[PDB]
Enzyme design. Structure first.
Site, PDB file in Angstrom:
ATOM      1  N   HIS A  46     -44.566  30.369  46.259  1.00 37.47           N
ATOM      2  CA  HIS A  46     -44.169  29.286  47.177  1.00 37.47           C
ATOM      3  C   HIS A  46     -44.690  29.582  48.581  1.00 37.47           C
ATOM      4  O   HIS A  46     -44.778  30.762  48.935  1.00 37.47           O
ATOM      5  CB  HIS A  46     -42.646  29.150  47.238  1.00 37.47           C
ATOM      6  CG  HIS A  46     -41.955  29.377  45.933  1.00 37.47           C
ATOM      7  ND1 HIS A  46     -41.360  30.572  45.636  1.00 37.47           N
ATOM      8  CD2 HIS A  46     -41.798  28.570  44.853  1.00 37.47           C
ATOM      9  CE1 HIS A  46     -40.822  30.496  44.438  1.00 37.47           C
ATOM     10  NE2 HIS A  46     -41.094  29.281  43.929  1.00 37.47           N
ATOM     11  N   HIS A  48     -43.312  29.624  52.074  1.00 35.27           N
ATOM     12  CA  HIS A  48     -42.079  29.756  52.887  1.00 35.27           C
ATOM     13  C   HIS A  48     -42.358  29.303  54.320  1.00 35.27           C
ATOM     14  O   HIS A  48     -43.536  29.163  54.730  1.00 35.27           O
ATOM     15  CB  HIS A  48     -41.585  31.185  52.840  1.00 35.27           C
ATOM     16  CG  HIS A  48     -41.018  31.524  51.512  1.00 35.27           C
ATOM     17  ND1 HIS A  48     -39.722  32.005  51.366  1.00 35.27           N
ATOM     18  CD2 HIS A  48     -41.559  31.447  50.275  1.00 35.27           C
ATOM     19  CE1 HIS A  48     -39.489  32.217  50.084  1.00 35.27           C
ATOM     20  NE2 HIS A  48     -40.589  31.859  49.399  1.00 35.27           N
ATOM     21  N   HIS A  63     -38.097  28.222  51.399  1.00 39.64           N
ATOM     22  CA  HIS A  63     -39.261  27.400  50.967  1.00 39.64           C
ATOM     23  C   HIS A  63     -39.486  26.332  52.042  1.00 39.64           C
ATOM     24  O   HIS A  63     -38.506  25.714  52.542  1.00 39.64           O
ATOM     25  CB  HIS A  63     -39.138  26.750  49.555  1.00 39.64           C
ATOM     26  CG  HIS A  63     -38.753  27.658  48.420  1.00 39.64           C
ATOM     27  ND1 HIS A  63     -38.405  27.190  47.086  1.00 39.64           N
ATOM     28  CD2 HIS A  63     -38.585  28.997  48.407  1.00 39.64           C
ATOM     29  CE1 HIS A  63     -38.091  28.234  46.373  1.00 39.64           C
ATOM     30  NE2 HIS A  63     -38.202  29.345  47.136  1.00 39.64           N
ATOM     31  N   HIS A  71     -35.229  22.179  45.253  1.00 41.42           N
ATOM     32  CA  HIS A  71     -36.280  22.986  44.592  1.00 41.42           C
ATOM     33  C   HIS A  71     -36.759  22.322  43.292  1.00 41.42           C
ATOM     34  O   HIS A  71     -35.905  21.916  42.469  1.00 41.42           O
ATOM     35  CB  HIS A  71     -35.758  24.400  44.351  1.00 41.42           C
ATOM     36  CG  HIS A  71     -36.814  25.253  43.756  1.00 41.42           C
ATOM     37  ND1 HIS A  71     -37.864  25.762  44.514  1.00 41.42           N
ATOM     38  CD2 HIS A  71     -37.048  25.612  42.478  1.00 41.42           C
ATOM     39  CE1 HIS A  71     -38.657  26.450  43.727  1.00 41.42           C
ATOM     40  NE2 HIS A  71     -38.185  26.363  42.476  1.00 41.42           N
ATOM     41  N   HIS A  80     -39.527  21.006  46.943  1.00 44.92           N
ATOM     42  CA  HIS A  80     -39.948  21.486  48.290  1.00 44.92           C
ATOM     43  C   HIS A  80     -41.463  21.304  48.418  1.00 44.92           C
ATOM     44  O   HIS A  80     -42.162  21.491  47.393  1.00 44.92           O
ATOM     45  CB  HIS A  80     -39.536  22.937  48.472  1.00 44.92           C
ATOM     46  CG  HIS A  80     -38.068  23.180  48.322  1.00 44.92           C
ATOM     47  ND1 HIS A  80     -37.558  24.393  47.927  1.00 44.92           N
ATOM     48  CD2 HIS A  80     -36.996  22.393  48.581  1.00 44.92           C
ATOM     49  CE1 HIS A  80     -36.236  24.350  47.958  1.00 44.92           C
ATOM     50  NE2 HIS A  80     -35.878  23.126  48.337  1.00 44.92           N
ATOM     51  N   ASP A  83     -43.310  24.304  46.991  1.00 43.06           N
ATOM     52  CA  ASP A  83     -43.036  24.708  45.590  1.00 43.06           C
ATOM     53  C   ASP A  83     -44.326  24.625  44.769  1.00 43.06           C
ATOM     54  O   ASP A  83     -44.753  23.486  44.426  1.00 43.06           O
ATOM     55  CB  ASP A  83     -41.955  23.810  44.979  1.00 43.06           C
ATOM     56  CG  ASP A  83     -40.575  24.120  45.507  1.00 43.06           C
ATOM     57  OD1 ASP A  83     -40.384  25.271  45.971  1.00 43.06           O
ATOM     58  OD2 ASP A  83     -39.711  23.214  45.427  1.00 43.06           O
ATOM     59  N   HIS A 120     -43.032  36.423  43.846  1.00 46.40           N
ATOM     60  CA  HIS A 120     -41.624  36.760  43.520  1.00 46.40           C
ATOM     61  C   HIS A 120     -41.565  37.693  42.304  1.00 46.40           C
ATOM     62  O   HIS A 120     -42.549  37.777  41.543  1.00 46.40           O
ATOM     63  CB  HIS A 120     -40.828  35.447  43.402  1.00 46.40           C
ATOM     64  CG  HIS A 120     -40.516  34.813  44.732  1.00 46.40           C
ATOM     65  ND1 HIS A 120     -39.513  35.294  45.542  1.00 46.40           N
ATOM     66  CD2 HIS A 120     -41.001  33.707  45.367  1.00 46.40           C
ATOM     67  CE1 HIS A 120     -39.434  34.559  46.642  1.00 46.40           C
ATOM     68  NE2 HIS A 120     -40.339  33.576  46.591  1.00 46.40           N
ATOM     69  N   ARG A 143     -38.774  39.084  46.817  1.00 48.95           N
ATOM     70  CA  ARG A 143     -40.111  38.835  47.417  1.00 48.95           C
ATOM     71  C   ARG A 143     -40.980  40.083  47.293  1.00 48.95           C
ATOM     72  O   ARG A 143     -40.703  41.060  47.994  1.00 48.95           O
ATOM     73  CB  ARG A 143     -39.870  38.437  48.876  1.00 48.95           C
ATOM     74  CG  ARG A 143     -39.007  37.191  49.000  1.00 48.95           C
ATOM     75  CD  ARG A 143     -38.831  36.670  50.421  1.00 48.95           C
ATOM     76  NE  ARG A 143     -37.942  35.516  50.415  1.00 48.95           N
ATOM     77  CZ  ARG A 143     -37.562  34.853  51.504  1.00 48.95           C
ATOM     78  NH1 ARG A 143     -38.013  35.211  52.700  1.00 48.95           N
ATOM     79  NH2 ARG A 143     -36.745  33.817  51.392  1.00 48.95           N
TER      80      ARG A 143
HETATM   81 CU   LIG Z   1     -40.837  31.821  47.343  1.00 49.35          CU
HETATM   82 ZN   LIG Z   2     -38.547  25.495  46.524  1.00 51.38          ZN
END
Ligand SMILES: [Cu+2]
Ligand SMILES: [Zn+2]
Ligand SMILES: [Cu+2]
Ligand SMILES: [Zn+2]
Lengths: 153, 153
Positions: A46, A48, A63, A71, A80, A83, A120, A143
């Site tokens: 994603h 951020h 996100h 999400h 998002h 995403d 992730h 993360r």
């Molecule tokens: Cu992420």
């Molecule tokens: Zn998201």
């Protein structure tokens, strides 16, 4: 006309990566790159919100979500902006990143320039999970590596 | 309204620091923070074109220069947009950064979002050196530390 960007993924662990972005006119953002040192399988990926590396990947915040939606995965109407779903590592610990996305951009209100890419610990459930966390982070867990998305030649 | 950015400076030597940026609408950008591990004296301090960290500080490219001018000092009409002059380190190797600039921005064509902050080994001669190198880099020399400028809370 043609915008390009780059992100160097770094973490405290062994996950490393290089992501390239290119957007020709109003065409979609084509994302291509590799991540190494991953455990085999799916890992959430994603944009951020914050390009802030003062606290490793923690300071990147949540996100990128200028529309204040829940999400999803990339194909979901409810997602998002940030995403980008999952990347799949093979048994060599390497994921090939190959994404095409028209919600993200390298210019305008949805631009991801100076935001943070994060990869992730675990699979993003694409917001299809039962618990509350799925509607937030798709339960992708910790993360592993992040970098600030920079303007490239 | 208010835009904030942050840059963590890193290199392969003792120089590091965190730089904060804030801009109210189309106003001046206010630059603050601290850099440590510098030699006493003045050090060139610039925005470079690319947010590309694939080859340390080298891949950042030349000074940000969208108006195609020669190098100068921040007060000069003839300057690169990225020309923020010199920071000053005390006996203790610490520079307190305190700059207000009217050419850089945190949005639009002059945006430094996704570009690189670089602090140099030597003083910037503000384009007054009378060799060709002065008109490109101010003879600031090598790149001690750099980082990609990120959107901040
Ligand atoms: Cu992420
Ligand atoms: Zn998201
Ligand atoms: Cu410089
Ligand atoms: Zn310059």
């Amino acid at each position: 006309m043609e915008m390009k960007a780059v992100c160097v993924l770094k973490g405290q662990g062994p996950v490393e990566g290089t992501i390239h972005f290119v957007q020709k006119g109003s065409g979609p953002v084509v994302v291509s790159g590799t991540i190494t040192g991953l455990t085999e399988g799916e890992h959430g990926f994603h944009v951020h919100q914050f390009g802030d590396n003062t606290q490793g990947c923690t300071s990147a915040g949540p996100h990128f979500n200028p529309l204040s939606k829940k999400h999803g995965g990339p194909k979901d109407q409810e997602r998002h902006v940030g995403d980008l779903g999952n990347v799949t590592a093979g048994k060599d610990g390497v994921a090939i990143v190959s994404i095409e996305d028209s919600l993200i951009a390298l210019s305008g209100d949805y631009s991801i320039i100076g935001r943070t890419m994060v990869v992730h610990e675990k699979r993003d459930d694409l917001g299809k999970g039962d618990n509350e966390e799925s509607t937030q982070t798709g339960n992708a867990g910790s993360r592993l590596a992040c970098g600030v998305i920079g303007i490239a030649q």
